Amino acid sequence: QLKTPKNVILLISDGAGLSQISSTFYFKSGTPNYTQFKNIGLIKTSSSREDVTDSASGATAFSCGIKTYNAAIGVADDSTAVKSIVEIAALNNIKTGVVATSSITEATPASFYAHALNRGLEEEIAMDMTESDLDFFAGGGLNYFTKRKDKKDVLAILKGNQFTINTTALTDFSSIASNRKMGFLLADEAMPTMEKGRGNFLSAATDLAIQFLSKDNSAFFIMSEGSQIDWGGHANNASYLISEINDFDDAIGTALAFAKKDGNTLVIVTSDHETGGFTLAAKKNKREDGSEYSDYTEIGPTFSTGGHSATLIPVFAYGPGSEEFIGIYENNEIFHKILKVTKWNQ
Amino acid sequence: QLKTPKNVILLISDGAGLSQISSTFYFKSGTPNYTQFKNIGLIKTSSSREDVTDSASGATAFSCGIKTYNAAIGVADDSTAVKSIVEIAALNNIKTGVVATSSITEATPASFYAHALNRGLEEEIAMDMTESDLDFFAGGGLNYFTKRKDKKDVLAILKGNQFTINTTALTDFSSIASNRKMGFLLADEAMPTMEKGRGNFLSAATDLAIQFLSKDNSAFFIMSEGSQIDWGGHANNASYLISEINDFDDAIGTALAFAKKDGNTLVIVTSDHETGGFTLAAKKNKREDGSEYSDYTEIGPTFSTGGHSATLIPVFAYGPGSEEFIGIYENNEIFHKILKVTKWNQ
Ligand SMILES: [Mg+2]
Ligand SMILES: [Mg+2]
Ligand SMILES: [Mg+2]
Ligand SMILES: [Mg+2]
Ligand SMILES: [Zn+2]
Ligand SMILES: [Zn+2]
Ligand SMILES: [Zn+2]
Ligand SMILES: [Zn+2]
């Protein structure tokens, strides 16, 4: 008989397989926050139609608990809308928040608040934000609200729905405490990469979300995404991938610091799939003309594809109910397990 | 208390990272035996001197509980001999066995019965067999016992040590049940590959070991190795790798079927490290103009290196004490955790 968590924080590292996670044990200063986890599981990520998943179907597995087609956003294999964990949270009086380092309309965040036939429908997804039950969000994507092809002003619709919107910077908690709902759109498209000076946006915004959503003793659900780990993978760019996931691990530390002190919070860390076939290979040394040989003393990261892969993905869980997440299961069971441990009305 | 295993079976898949494990979920008929595990942990595999380990230091970490230099067999970083789990087991009146699909003198099994400064000293390692307390072994490597530089007949010496030796085939248990010690040397060098018709030697030999060592109600320790998964990795040969790890997963099923019925047996499955950067990438198609694009509906396994990599490696544990093996830790803690749960003393 497991404990029942009041709050849940789901952290998603997009495109991080176990090799990507492992990089933090060789390329980060200090010990990775990954090490705080005891309860570990594995998820199989295939979609309803494809052995190799995309971010949309992979994230909809988590948010809605079904296998669906690549590119689907909160819809079933037949394109019908399906009830999400955010919509369940709202109906159980749970405050909800979403954070990402991509545009907020990108596939991962979108899967938690919208329902669309295709991830490419980003202006539609932005409009869906206005009819969602989200109480908090932070990410990029200002363009999809204020520079649309349909020239509509969705910002104004957002505010007309009780959202306080900031497009300048993240503020402290006291700045927004009196607000009913809070949205941060801090970039036209994607937030800056770590290498271009994003700094600790992800941890800070996650921390902000926790404070805001736990106002007045309220239970909360947060999804925070380290979005750009995936983009380093596609680019086969090791320093990009590594800096992005180091930042993600920082965010884990933030969620865990709150959970350990709160004692009523379940923290789940996982990924939607792996990308690039990132590998912590031996550093390649030279010499005159044997030319190229392997030196096992050090690591020289390599890649084998420009796209995703179907490896199983690690799941990490800490807090009340975390035991439910061990063993091996389908990605969509994440949803059903969250629902199980929280005991929320379906 | 909960709980003390009487017996331990350690199954080592040489060179299998999570991606290699994952192939069993796409390329094997039926559900992988991997799915039987609930308790899962992760190990860091770096040696005492190298970020990227080899099979010798990697296995010595398991067998002797210390970090050591690449190529070391049952010796510490300063090259001094250290007590292995097989020796400790003997001291505690525990029967012992080693099974491998490579030569029985190869790095992995050797680290469990021999002590040598370098893994390449295989004729010395075969001779070390004569001074170990091993009760049972099965594998290849007949050459290292009978066609040696020193022209000695090591089988003669073993037979003096109460070994019965079979160089013809795996037999029924009734053929060996009255032997005091049993050794199978079923190939001159490595056992045949699955593709060349090795069949279920690995499962069969493990079953034989269990039945033989649990004679007279004795407790036992067994290490069985899926030795050739690694060679598949080095060769960047996908069918070779996958067929070898599917065989390994059959061995898992064999061990678990016994353990579940026995109720007093701890089964640990892990790997020494990953090799080849094996990746379950999307199938690559060619458009007669630009050629390469991805088809996410199917998998096309790819590789990115010819050597090992430093990814964290999954640990699976079932049975009494299995909870001790979760979380993230150094590879050499495998030794200490086994001792802790078995209460095998020094
Ligand atoms: Mg994403
Ligand atoms: Mg770079
Ligand atoms: Mg080996
Ligand atoms: Mg082949
Ligand atoms: Zn993704
Ligand atoms: Zn991607
Ligand atoms: Zn190895
Ligand atoms: Zn190797």
Side-chain angles (χ1 to χ4, degrees), chain A residues 18 22 25-26 34 37-38 44 46 50-52 277 279-280 296-297 302-304 307-312 326-327, chain B residues 18 22 25-26 37-38 44 46 50-52 277 279-280 296-297 302-304 307-312 326-328:
Chain A
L18 183 52
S22 297
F25 289 70
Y26 296 95
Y34 283 102
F37 288 105
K38 295 312 177 176
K44 189 186 176 175
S46 301
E50 297 104 353
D51 285 341
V52 179
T279 298
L280 297 177
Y296 278 27
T297 51
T302 64
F303 299 88
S304 65
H308 303 173
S309 74
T311 173
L312 297 173
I326 68 184
Chain B
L18 183 51
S22 291
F25 291 75
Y26 296 91
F37 291 103
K38 298 304 169 192
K44 191 182 177 174
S46 296
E50 297 102 354
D51 280 346
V52 183
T279 296
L280 296 175
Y296 275 30
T297 67
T302 58
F303 295 87
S304 64
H308 299 171
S309 71
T311 174
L312 298 185
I326 70 180
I328 309 184

Side-chain angles (χ1 to χ4, degrees), chain A residues 195 237-240:
Chain A
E195 294 178 330
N237 181 340
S239 78
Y240 184 12

Side-chain angles (χ1 to χ4, degrees), chain B residues 39 41 57 62 84 88 136 140 171 181 199 230 242 252 279:
Chain B
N39 301 316
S57 62
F62 300 153
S84 76
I88 291 161
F136 182 105
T171 52
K181 293 169 175 176
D230 172 76
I242 295 172
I252 296 175
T279 296

Side-chain angles (χ1 to χ4, degrees), chain B residues 246-314:
Chain B
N246 284 346
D247 178 59
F248 181 76
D249 184 75
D250 285 353
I252 296 175
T254 295
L256 294 181
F258 170 81
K260 287 188 167 174
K261 170 173 289 194
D262 177 81
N264 211 354
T265 296
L266 169 64
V267 179
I268 299 149
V269 177
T270 193
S271 299
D272 58 347
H273 54 84
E274 196 273 338
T275 126
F278 181 78
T279 296
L280 296 175
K283 164 176 178 274
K284 270 48 228 178
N285 278 344
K286 232 165 185 62
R287 41 175 67 195
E288 55 78 58
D289 103 74
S291 299
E292 210 136 1
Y293 69 93
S294 293
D295 181 359
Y296 275 30
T297 67
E298 296 181 37
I299 293 164
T302 58
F303 295 87
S304 64
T305 178
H308 299 171
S309 71
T311 174
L312 298 185
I313 295 295

Side-chain angles (χ1 to χ4, degrees), chain A residues 250-322:
Chain A
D250 278 356
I252 296 177
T254 293
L256 289 183
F258 174 80
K260 283 191 172 181
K261 138 172 33 197
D262 178 72
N264 298 319
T265 303
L266 163 68
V267 177
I268 301 153
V269 175
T270 186
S271 308
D272 57 343
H273 57 82
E274 190 274 342
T275 126
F278 182 74
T279 298
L280 297 177
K283 209 168 198 164
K284 227 88 192 299
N285 276 358
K286 263 287 182 295
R287 89 172 161 246
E288 294 145 68
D289 274 331
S291 207
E292 189 146 306
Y293 74 95
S294 299
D295 179 2
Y296 278 27
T297 51
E298 293 184 56
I299 295 162
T302 64
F303 299 88
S304 65
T305 174
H308 303 173
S309 74
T311 173
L312 297 173
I313 294 288
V315 173
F316 306 86
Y318 176 92
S322 62

